[PDB]
Amino acid sequence: LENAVLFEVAWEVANKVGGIYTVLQTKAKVTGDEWGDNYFLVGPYTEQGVRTQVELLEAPTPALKRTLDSMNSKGCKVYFGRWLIEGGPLVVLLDVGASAWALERWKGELWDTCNIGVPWYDREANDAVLFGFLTTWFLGEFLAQSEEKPHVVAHFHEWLAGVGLCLCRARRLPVATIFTTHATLLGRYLCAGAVDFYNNLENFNVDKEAGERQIYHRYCMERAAAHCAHVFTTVSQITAIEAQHLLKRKPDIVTPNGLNVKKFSAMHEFQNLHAQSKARIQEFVRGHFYGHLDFNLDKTLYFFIAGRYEFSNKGADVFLEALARLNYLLRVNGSEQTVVAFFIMPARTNNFNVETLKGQAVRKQLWDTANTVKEKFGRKLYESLLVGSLPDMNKMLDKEDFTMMKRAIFATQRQSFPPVCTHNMLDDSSDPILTTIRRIGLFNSSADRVKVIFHPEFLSSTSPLLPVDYEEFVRGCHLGVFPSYYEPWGYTPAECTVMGIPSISTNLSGFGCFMEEHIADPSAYGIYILDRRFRSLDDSCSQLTSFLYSFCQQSRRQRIIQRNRTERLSDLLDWKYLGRYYMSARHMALSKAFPEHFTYEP
Amino acid sequence: GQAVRKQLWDTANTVKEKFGRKLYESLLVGSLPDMNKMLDKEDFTMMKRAIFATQRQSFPPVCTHNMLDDSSDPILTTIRRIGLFNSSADRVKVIFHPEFLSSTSPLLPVDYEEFVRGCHLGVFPSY
Amino acid sequence: DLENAVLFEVAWEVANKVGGIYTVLQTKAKVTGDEWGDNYFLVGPYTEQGVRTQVELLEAPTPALKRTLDSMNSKGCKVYFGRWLIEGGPLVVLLDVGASAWALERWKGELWDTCNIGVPWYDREANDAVLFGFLTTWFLGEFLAQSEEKPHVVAHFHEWLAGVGLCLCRARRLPVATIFTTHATLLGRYLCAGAVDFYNNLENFNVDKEAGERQIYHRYCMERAAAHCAHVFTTVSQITAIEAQHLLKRKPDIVTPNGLNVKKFSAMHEFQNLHAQSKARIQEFVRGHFYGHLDFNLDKTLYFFIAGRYEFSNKGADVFLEALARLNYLLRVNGSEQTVVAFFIMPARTNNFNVETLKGQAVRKQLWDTANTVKEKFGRKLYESLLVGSLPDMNKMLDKEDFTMMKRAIFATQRQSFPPVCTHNMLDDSSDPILTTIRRIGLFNSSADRVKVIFHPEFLSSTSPLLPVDYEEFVRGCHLGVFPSYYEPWGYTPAECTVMGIPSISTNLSGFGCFMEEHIADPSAYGIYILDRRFRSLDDSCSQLTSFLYSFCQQSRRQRIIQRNRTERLSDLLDWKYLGRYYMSARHMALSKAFPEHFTYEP
Ligand SMILES: O=P(O)(O)OC[C@H]1O[C@H](O)[C@H](O)[C@@H](O)[C@@H]1O
Ligand SMILES: O=P(O)(O)OC[C@H]1O[C@H](O)[C@H](O)[C@@H](O)[C@@H]1O
């Protein structure tokens, strides 16, 4: 309300390291009008990041120029710029060149103030604290040199900026404080290390488990920041439950991350981009299985699962045993429906697999041998239509063309079952996905109604096998199944829902909890939500199959309606809707720190 | 006639691709083409109508362009006199092009140096 | 109702393919093929040309039907019972109109002691209609006689050509319920142009005088009498119902609007996919017809569509031409980038195509030739550059040869003269009502003009040198289909438009426009603009049309798509599924009125 200058503090600002970068990428537009030009982004300085993202500019206000000049003084570095990303974000890039002065003197101060020590072994630990003092310096100077300074909000993202949170309030600078944890630090190691992490979220000895992993300095850094914040904020309501029972600070507001959504001129252009991308997947599955194309591709479905290669976290284990049962239900029942599940999770690869790479080259061979004799037919028809005669149709193709086509069919034929992995792996037997595939019994056989393709790399437009982008490949697949146990927010299930493609999310996922909260209808709107908190592994697998078989039994027309319904939920995941929550958080903090000038509006 | 030639090239490209797509899903399936079902009733009606539009009763023209003085033109006057109206019975068809060949031409898009090389014989009686 | 009853659909257009009634009867077959099942039959004229295409002969299922067919065939009359090959498998009783040996004079003398209507020998179909009339009454008569305890029969009569055989059934007093469905008022057609303000003077028109002045009295008398000798009188349109109330002198009991069997695509947006595909093929035409004069953004261009028989006053081309002349002003005096390319697809007498509409297509092709040459040459130089490992230089991709090729293409694709209005050459160019108006209003397809009028004097065909696309596809390509009319009993040209996703400007005088006013409350909101032409002058109607056209012109890309999706929803209204519920009321209304005890009143 009252004019004020706020700062968004994160490590991922002009770094491009984590997913927090992608959050603040498109957050800049919606926050660029709510506080206007007054808002800033405090971030670390990298010379690599400047050449790409940062364009340096002078200070508009004379107080800011004094603050930047003073920041240059005392062996500290500032590089005020403007981020080249859309929104016009004015960025305050602080270098680690101030390592000589801030780290040694203020580590003792941090000890006399926060009582948190930093091990020298951990690299980003010493780098985070430096960045922490540098932020407090800039905020401190901004409050001091600006006469009658408006209420300040310091918006802190991730553990790396969590240290500078307690310092901004340690110096008692008149500043309202927000901490937005996009992922709980201790929650990541607790997810796999401790069984039933969600079930035992209350039980977990909060100090013991952090110390067993030698991450205590980091948990202590993430906490304290929580306690030394008026408004504590989580992206997910499931992460809010995490913070309530582990970080021990209940999130004041839940501000879910948002995606800028591409608005097309036609509201059905996503469905036009569906058929175009489906055909490019059709060129792949026609090629990968050659001589084994005894399945109707007109009535075939594509299931999609992506993310970092985490077998338990990105819930590949749930989805693999579910397709094994979907193998049964589509085979014991007289069904023509074939499902081609794609596993796009990048891992260590030597090179491309021989038979897959051959299959694509024989695919074009059976396109070349179907273009040569096609042109023969084309000329014979053009010279028959010009004469004035309908093609005989039994003399259009010569004996040579039948020998060409007869040899094309002889080359294509294979006996070996089509491969499961698109690439060749260094550790094939040790690979958790490939080990499960051979266990469940899906070798991409003729009898199998589900054929598993594991592309052990990110997709690229410049690829020998599958030359399509990630964004395009999602739009091609019919359904995007994302079972999860530990996703703070689903950046992959949600990018799916931003597009017209329906996504099977889960209750433990941040996206799935958001869809349960906002909209009342789960399956009706398209987004299937899997109960994984109050259910066993086996029930969760079976619920996936009832969800998968529901989509399998769906008709052509009903699939299109559901894909149109999922398009309507893009507005819900737009920064336009999901940035309202952050705006409330900023307003809520000002009220907590300084009540008289700013109305709380609670 | 030039537009019809491209029309009978377009109607011979549409059903060619329809032949090609049905063949490619026949070669991939593992079966040589049937060769009789390859073209549907939709394709046959396209080709049957294309032929019906092609049909002309007028004999193809002696001069490619339209002249200001057609009757006064010494070449065209001789053609109608000798009796070569580009008929089916005629074994010689005379095709006068009243203007220089060009590559930027709606009809006959070939330049003079290329057009000479295309023709089998270059007859030049002179006085 | 629909229990223990038989319906005979009697029309001249049954297995003939002459008029629009053929399409109505053909399409109605499927919805009527389950309401009365296999029991319904269609009585029609017999043509050996029509049999080879449409009729497959079959034996009689019921033994009584064999008796009826044999007795009529034996008693100096000709019948060819069979099944129509159109969808719904209608069973057709093709009666030979060629068998005129004795009925022509003896039966006409019987017609005069009964109906007191005489037939002139000069009029061909007049003598053929009455023959077909007696033959129907014979078949119905035998069917009632030889079938012991016969279910009540509903004789469903379409057009004046069957209208004579209507009164015979009542004259014999055979137990038969009777329906007459006039798809177009006979006397209304000549009154439309001959008498000024036909709709305004519909009550005033001297009903017997005007019929005699044009020597159609035998047929007006034939169409009337059929009306009076029918329990249920039925009109296709509510505007035709007003016509019949003051011309045929019968208020139509029900209005059963004609319907189209809509093509439903697996995707509910496939019409809009077929929009862009067909728009591009129109874009290829607009790039050709206008060459060297292409200074108009084609992304922001609209296509207006008008079709039908070549009737300048009836199909309301006069209204639409003076309206584009004002739309020329409103899009030019206001700083607008919007260009509108109106297409007039009304077939007329043509000699051949036009030099500059076929040369423009040829230069469009040369500029696709001299682009494809310098693109493959670009492509080959690019392919050998990416393999070496270098991004294309972009100043050295194209050589000096390519610049000379492209520079000469640009020189050839230059014209001083403005693009042609018509896309063919006419026999009577000056006498042509459309072309005369175009030169009068001042739209010569100029650079300054924001509306360019193209009149394709012939029907669209896939096999065409200039514009190779079907009629069905061309409608789907155009943004808006404007159909002003004065006398369209039921507009199928605007009707088929609304079946597709394309919005259509109908009128109050049209049968389709009156239907859209009656059923749905929202006119312009649902897409179908309705023009007031009954209570307004010519000039006001042109201006109402201008405000309707300018409303579509000021519409954005996105708002156009929404309206086209809304017009798709109105296809269900024009489906025989929604429009055949009206014929069912007419049949139900008849069984009851003719035979009250057996069939419920159904009011
Ligand atoms: O994805 P499916 O349910 O197989 O449906 C396939 C359909 O996808 C899109 O909607 C396209 O626009 C249609 O042309 C296609 O028929
Ligand atoms: O017809 P317009 O309003 O110019 O819109 C043009 C649009 O038509 C359809 O909806 C197509 O699917 C779109 O690809 C295209 O953008």
What's the full length of chain B, in residues?
A: 127
- Chain A: nearest CA to B125, how far in angstroms? 34
Strands C152-158, C339-345: parallel, antiparallel or unpaired by DSSP? unpaired
Cα–Cα distance for residue pair A496/C423, rounded to 1 Å: 49
Q: Which amino acids bring their CB within 6 angstroms of ligand 2?
A: A 265-266, 269, 272; C 272-273, 275-276, 479, 557, 560-561
Chain A CB within 8 Å of residue B46 CB? no
Chain A CB within 8 Å of residue C386 CB? no
Contacts of C among chains (3+ CB pairs under 8 A): A, B
User: Per the annotation, does C27 bind a ligand?
Assistant: no
Return phi, psi of residue C424, to 5°.
-140, 175
Q: Are A352 and A360 in contact (CB under 8 A)?
A: no
Ligand 1 nearest atom to the CA of residue A278, by list position: 1
Closest CA to A539 of A493, A502, A507, A494: A507
Which positions in chain A touch C561 (Cβ < 8 Å)?
265-267
Chain B CB within 8 Å of residue A404 CB? no
Q: How far is CA C32 from CA C9, C45, C126, C236, in A?
A: 10, 20, 29, 17
Q: Are A483 and A530 in contact (CB under 8 A)?
A: yes
Q: Which residue has the tokens 């008029």?
A: C19
Chain A CB within 8 Å of residue B53 CB? no
Nearest residue (by CA) to ligand 2, atom 4, is C557
Return phi, psi of residue C9, to 5°.
-90, 115
Q: CATH fold of C5-261+578-594, please?
A: Rossmann fold (3.40.50)
Cα–Cα distance for residue pair A121/A214, rounded to 1 Å: 11
Return phi, psi of residue A213, to 5°.
-100, 5
Q: How many CB pairs under 8 A join A and B?
A: 81
3-state secondary structure C535-548: CCCHHHHHHHHHHH
C-beta atoms of B12 and A406 within 8 A: no
Structure tokens at A220: 């202590």
C-beta atoms of C408 and B49 within 8 A: no
Ligand 2 nearest atom to the CA of residue C273, by list position: 12
Chain A CB within 8 Å of residue C267 CB? yes
Residue A88, CB-side half-sphere exposure with 13 Å CA sphere: 8
Q: Where are the extended beta strands (E) located within A283-377?
A: 300-306, 338-344, 349-352
Query: CB neighbours (10 Å) of residue A568?
Result: 13
Cα angle C204, C205, C209 (rounded to 5 degrees) comes to: 140
3-state secondary structure A450-515: EEEEECCCCCECCCCCCECCHHHHHHHCCEEECCCCCCCCCHHHHHHHHCCCCEEEECCCHHHHHH
Which positions in chain A touch C267 (Cβ < 8 Å)?
271, 557, 560
3-state secondary structure A366-394: HHHHHHHHHHHHHHHHHHHHCCCCCCCCC
- Sheet containing C55-57: which strands, arranged edge to edge? C55-57, C79-84, C91-95, C41-45, C5-11, C152-158, C176-182, C232-235, C254-255
**DSSP code for A98:** G
Among residues 522-551 of chain C, which lie with CB inside 8 Å of chain B? none
C contact test, residue of A271, A390, A556 with most C CBs within 10 A: A271
Chain A CB within 8 Å of residue C558 CB? yes
Cα–Cα distance for residue pair A183/A246, rounded to 1 Å: 13
Cα–Cα distance for residue pair C366/C210, rounded to 1 Å: 59
Chain B CB within 8 Å of residue A391 CB? yes
Containing C239, the helix (H) or strand (E) segment is helix C238-246
Beta carbons within 8 Å of C237's beta carbon, 6+ residues apart: C255, C257, C489, C490, C510, C511, C512, C514, C515
Which positions in chain C touch B46 (Cβ < 8 Å)?
462-463
- Chain C: nearest CA to B59, how far in angstroms? 15
Cα–Cα distance for residue pair A261/A471, rounded to 1 Å: 12
Q: Which amino acid is at A368?
A: D
Closest CA to A429 of A420, A352, A346, A457: A420
The alpha carbon torsion through A545, A546, A549, A554 (nearest 10 deg) reads -150
Q: Where are the extended beta strands (E) located within C346-501?
A: 350-353, 424-426, 451-455, 480-482
* Residue to mutate, C268, C277, C279, ligand 2, most ligand atoms under 8 Å from C-beta: C279
Which positions in chain B touch C464 (Cβ < 8 Å)?
7, 53
3-state secondary structure of C364: helix
Q: First and final CA of chain A: distance in angstroms?
A: 14
Q: Which amino acid is at A227?
A: H
Ligand 2 nearest atom to the CA of residue A265, by list position: 16
Chain breaks of chain B after residues with C–N above 2.5 Å: none
Task: Determine if ligand 1 sits within 6 Å of the CB of residue A559.
Answer: yes
Cα–Cα distance for residue pair C255/C234, rounded to 1 Å: 6
Q: Are A539 and A513 in contact (CB under 8 A)?
A: no
Structure tokens at C214: 């044009």
Q: Are B84 and B78 in contact (CB under 8 A)?
A: no
- The class that CATH gives domain A6-260+577-593 is alpha beta
Whole-number Å distance, alpha carbon A204 to ligand 1 midpoint, is 49
Cα–Cα distance for residue pair A47/A42, rounded to 1 Å: 16
The experimental method behind these coordinates is cryo-EM
Ligand 1 nearest atom to the CA of residue A559, by list position: 3
